[PDB]
Write an enzyme that holds these catalytic residues in place. Structure first.
Site, PDB file in Angstrom:
ATOM      1  N   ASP A   4       5.399  -4.511   7.187  1.00 64.84           N
ATOM      2  CA  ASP A   4       5.618  -4.985   5.828  1.00 64.84           C
ATOM      3  C   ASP A   4       6.965  -4.505   5.299  1.00 64.84           C
ATOM      4  O   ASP A   4       7.203  -3.304   5.194  1.00 64.84           O
ATOM      5  CB  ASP A   4       4.476  -4.474   4.941  1.00 64.84           C
ATOM      6  CG  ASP A   4       4.371  -5.211   3.636  1.00 64.84           C
ATOM      7  OD1 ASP A   4       5.400  -5.682   3.098  1.00 64.84           O
ATOM      8  OD2 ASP A   4       3.221  -5.347   3.160  1.00 64.84           O
ATOM      9  N   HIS A  49       3.813  -8.601   5.758  1.00 66.28           N
ATOM     10  CA  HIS A  49       3.285  -8.646   4.410  1.00 66.28           C
ATOM     11  C   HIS A  49       2.327  -9.806   4.181  1.00 66.28           C
ATOM     12  O   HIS A  49       1.472  -9.740   3.300  1.00 66.28           O
ATOM     13  CB  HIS A  49       4.440  -8.795   3.447  1.00 66.28           C
ATOM     14  CG  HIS A  49       4.038  -8.653   2.024  1.00 66.28           C
ATOM     15  ND1 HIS A  49       3.545  -7.476   1.501  1.00 66.28           N
ATOM     16  CD2 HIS A  49       4.035  -9.549   1.014  1.00 66.28           C
ATOM     17  CE1 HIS A  49       3.277  -7.646   0.222  1.00 66.28           C
ATOM     18  NE2 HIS A  49       3.566  -8.894  -0.100  1.00 66.28           N
ATOM     19  N   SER A  89      -0.986  -7.955  -2.330  1.00 64.39           N
ATOM     20  CA  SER A  89       0.327  -7.536  -2.798  1.00 64.39           C
ATOM     21  C   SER A  89       0.286  -7.146  -4.276  1.00 64.39           C
ATOM     22  O   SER A  89      -0.439  -6.231  -4.616  1.00 64.39           O
ATOM     23  CB  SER A  89       1.367  -8.582  -2.462  1.00 64.39           C
ATOM     24  OG  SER A  89       2.651  -7.971  -2.551  1.00 64.39           O
TER      25      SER A  89
END
Length: 262
Positions: A176, A208, A130
């Site tokens: 996501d 995610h 991320s």
């Protein structure tokens, strides 16, 4: 002929397994010891040799525990790997880039001799989840000497990574909602130069947080990418090219610039 080859000849089974063929040990890095990052854990092969070294960053609100499985798994295929904590869990991606850099320096120059002697400091890579994936892209843009970058469900406000020449595998997650592939992963992949070694692997049925949950696809392709590019190990080209280009239930899509100038 390739002095950097390590480990037995690979198979899909060997790469999908929970553990690779190298027994692994750990060295803690306290926050005190770390300069420019929040500490972490260095996973490394018990078997003495020189290996490439990899730094992995977590994402926003994340700690090293969220990426531990990946650090240990990659190390078990013949790499020295540090999973970091960041200075704070809320650090932004370009800060995380600096922290990844500091973590590489730590392994090479500040860890115990056991760790330092197991690293070929000319063969380095970065990965992250991320915002940590955003950090990986930023550092790759700054450091063309890096051998590989693997942004996992990456997040960054800058979409233009046309400056990156490091071999880059972006792993996206179809569902996501935090770093949607339409507005993060795919824009990043598409702005990377067409001329470089790159690939985009989108996981099917993945949130995610897929990179934080032990995952045979992430494990297999991350190791194959690091092998091919950190170790120049063309025994791993077979997994990447043509690659898994609608293995439904596993991979939604796969794009690449295969075969990467064999």
């Amino acid at each position: 002929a390739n002095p950097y080859e390590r480990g037995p000849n690979p198979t899909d089974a060997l790469l999908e397994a929970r553990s690779g063929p190298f027994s692994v040990s750990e060295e803690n890095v306290s926050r005190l010891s770390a300069s420019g990052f929040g500490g972490g854990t260095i996973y490394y092969p018990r078997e003495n040799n020189t290996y490439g070294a990899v730094a992995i960053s977590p994402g926003y609100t994340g700690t090293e525990a969220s990426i531990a499985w990946l650090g240990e798994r990659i190390a078990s295929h013949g790499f020295v790997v540090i999973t970091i904590d960041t200075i704070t869990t809320l650090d932004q991606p370009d800060s995380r880039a600096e922290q990844l850099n500091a973590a590489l320096n730590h392994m090479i120059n500040r860890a115990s001799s056991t760790v330092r002697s197991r690293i070929d400091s000319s063969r380095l890579a970065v990965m992250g989840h991320s915002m940590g994936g955003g950090g990986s892209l930023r550092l790759a843009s700054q450091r063309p000497d890096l051998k590989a970058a693997i942004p996992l469900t990456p997040w960054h406000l800058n979409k233009n990574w046309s400056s990156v020449t490091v071999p880059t595998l972006i792993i996206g997650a179809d569902l996501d909602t935090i770093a949607p592939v339409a507005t993060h992963a795919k824009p990043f992949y598409n702005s990377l130069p067409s001329s470089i070694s790159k690939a985009y692997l989108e996981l099917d049925g993945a949130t995610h947080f897929a990179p934080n949950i032990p995952n045979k696809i992430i494990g297999k392709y991350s190791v194959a990418w690091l092998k091919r590019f950190v170790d120049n190990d063309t025994r791993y080209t077979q997994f990447l090219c043509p690659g898994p280009r609608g293995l439904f239930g596993e991979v939604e899509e796969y794009r690449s610039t295969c075969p990467f100038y064999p």
